[PDB]
Design a protein around this nucleic acid. Sequence first.
RNA 1: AUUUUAAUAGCUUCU
RNA 2: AGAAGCUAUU
Lengths: 114, 833, 60
Amino acid sequence: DKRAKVTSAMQTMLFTMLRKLDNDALNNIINNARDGCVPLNIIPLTTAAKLMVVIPDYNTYKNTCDGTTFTYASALWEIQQVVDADSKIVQLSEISMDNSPNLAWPLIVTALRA
Amino acid sequence: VYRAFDIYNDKVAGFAKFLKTHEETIYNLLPAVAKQRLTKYTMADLVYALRHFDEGNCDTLKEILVTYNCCDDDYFNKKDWYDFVENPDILRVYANLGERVRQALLKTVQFCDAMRNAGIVGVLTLDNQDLNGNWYDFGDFIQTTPGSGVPVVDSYYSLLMPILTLTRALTAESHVDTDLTKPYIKWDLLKYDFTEERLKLFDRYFKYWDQTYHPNCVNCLDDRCILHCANFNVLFSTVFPPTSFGPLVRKIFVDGVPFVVSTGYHFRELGVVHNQDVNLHSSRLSFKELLVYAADPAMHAASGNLLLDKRTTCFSVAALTNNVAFQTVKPGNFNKDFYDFAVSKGFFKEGSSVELKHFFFAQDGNAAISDYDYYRYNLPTMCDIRQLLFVVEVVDKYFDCYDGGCINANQVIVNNLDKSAGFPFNKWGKARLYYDSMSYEDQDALFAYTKRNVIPTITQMNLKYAISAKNRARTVAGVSICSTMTNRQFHQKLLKSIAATRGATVVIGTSKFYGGWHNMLKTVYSDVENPHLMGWDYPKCDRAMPNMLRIMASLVLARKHTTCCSLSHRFYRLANECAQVLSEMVMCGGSLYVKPGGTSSGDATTAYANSVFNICQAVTANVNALLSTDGNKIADKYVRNLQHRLYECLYRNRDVDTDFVNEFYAYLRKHFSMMILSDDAVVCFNSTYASQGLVASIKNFKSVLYYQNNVFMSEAKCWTETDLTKGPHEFCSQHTMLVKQGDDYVYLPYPDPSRILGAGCFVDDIVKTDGTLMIERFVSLAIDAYPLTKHPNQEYADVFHLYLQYIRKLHDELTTSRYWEPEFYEAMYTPHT
Amino acid sequence: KMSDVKCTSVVLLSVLQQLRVESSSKLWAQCVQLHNDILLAKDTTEAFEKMVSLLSVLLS
RNA sequence: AUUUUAAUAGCUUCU
RNA sequence: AGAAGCUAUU
Ligand SMILES: [Zn+2]
Ligand SMILES: [Zn+2]
């Protein structure tokens, strides 16, 4: 009965992973390959619709995520959310030099493709 | 002048340091040729300096560095400037030589072309080329019909091989028009083959390499061809985009639903590999295919978010979760009763020679990734390939006494089935479920599948609670269940055979009790003429292991299948190992990263691979010590002939000289005896030969690690012993002493008193202090601490007595006598069982 | 005296963890650094001062 | 959510 | 003197 239980578990996980897959862009990128074979690393680079950034300190932030839209990997990302290492929302206007000590590093940025 | 020379005469041979106290027509026959001025130092000087590096004697290296504006003189005023781990900046400094090195390479080719157009035959040497790339010596060249000349360049390129990766010589190849000021080439995202570029690079730089090169190693002839072509591919893979490596994926249809699966793999070393058992349209999914698809990293990454982690320098793939994870480590638990008893019994007096060193160290939420960012010490390394081939033969001569091959699913022995299965299986149960739910037919079919395809797997990173005298969290790498099952079926026979042998170079499986320590020490002492003892440790074993040596270890292990696996089957097995434990996706706190290389500790063959690695490094040090000595200085005819034949078999004989391999193995067994366990080693060696230079010393080992392992070996982790009556200074965290048992004298291993005291004082779980049903814990600690009663120091000898009085306290609380009698523990180190 | 200081630091850090301080990142990080520096320290004076600081953290 | 291998002690069942 | 199951220790 376990064998059946883990068989169903695998089937479900596979189909749910499938249900989250943005198929149109994947078709667009697969159909250009010589024989329909693409490297795996570029699929989230050219297909993902959400980006997560982890920033240890302020220098990296100001060199990476200055403002509300930034360009990364030949695409434009609109910043959607910023959270601290304690998992509490941090307002964008708070990330300055004076308020750097109060914040709990590293910072996690959630951006959407645009 | 006292400079580096590469020589092969009728009398002497070698790459060493010597004193330096027709040609017109040849020069007339031969822009890569000098007229003019000649750089004080040649390319031989630089090669010798970087290959035989010794701190406190690197004056030539310093002069070469400050001459060419690689750094300034004050850069050498700071301590540990040459250390790879403590001062990473030296790498950048070394790269300032790179382009110059590259220029030299190109000029060599021009020179050789000239010879091929003038009918000139001659052996290229590094010492005829200036640091500017100018060849300026044509001594022994003879004449032939023009258009049919031939250069011999195997020693030149072979000796130059490590410096190509050390100086990052091919960086300019990654720029537009091969120009450092020009921008970087913008490769297509979808390109993965790169075979033609590999062939073009080979013809540009190694046009006159006699052997055949296979860009995709699936086309090789044997394991030696695999090593040679993989070395070239290691050099050439550094100029291609990092997104072009790893699994190659495709879209298939199961019941008309489009899935994403992995159909091939692009290696940095083995080239492109394609799976043979592929069906584009499938009907139904049984257990086996469901397992294979669920362990596949392709869909997991394809259904994840883009990730950009600035805390790490490892390539990132995706983030499975929407929020990053943080795993900390807690402090240990304090045993108040044992502390009170030790204080009452008169311990912990200020100034006592016994002090508490080992503790449990807490960590913050960024510990797993902080430990994961230690693969940054793993650098791409190109090996001297002639040396690697001879050394791999000698190293397999150490494994010619074991039984190995393939077993079935009913012959497999698994110790613990309540251990974890890895991602994604850890979600559904322990390894017991996946061993019980698969029939033997299913496991055999899965093995047959791995013999013709490649299954990429994800590992997990876990934090291990432990005790140490260092402030460092430790992470272990857990592997997926499928990789473990086929590795078990592939390797268990040989591994059990190794673990069930006594009196051998590898002492894995031999107990230290009942006279085991005495037997091992007596076996390693052998009958060496003037014995001295030497021991060492590897600074960072799994992080800083070059991938070529790991591939060599896997090939040596898999050589036992001469009669049960065809060469395609063996190559696909090796590809599975490389894709599963060498450079695979690593799940670290909910995100996927790319492993640079080295070693996964949760592998099935870790300790034995480490032992192969130890034997390879030791043999390499012996070869580099023998070959770099003045042959005229050596006074023994046998040793001089041995050196000459070693050079000839290295750089002048493509075929394998089995008789000389046997001879060299005998020489090593007579004069350099090893006892080896994983990365730990104790050597008994001939003092006179090492002083004369005929066998390796510890400095040869340090130089070999400098130019091969990308680490620096500090004297604070190496030990030497002269008196044999005192055993090894350390071996597997044990000290040695020669006690008197009966009317005999026997070697006994004892631990560090601080470690046993801390083990008693600190635990990891609270119930370990409350149950009081842990008398077996103190009995085991006392079994470990018993030899301390023979130490001359009384405070050492008192720890076992304290443990006995505490065991009595515990028993009197519960309530045999044997547990406070010294006979029960004295019987644990007596030869008769 | 040194060993008493180290053992008391271990006890106090365990108590703080029991006090759910591990769920505040900066507090717990400062406590971890203080505890590790106590453990690797050699002179008892600054170790005593660090013990005092950790005790003030606990009482806070 | 806690890997690999080796050795050893103690407890239980059983020819 | 053996096998198998469980815990502990290095
Ligand atoms: Zn080949
Ligand atoms: Zn086989």
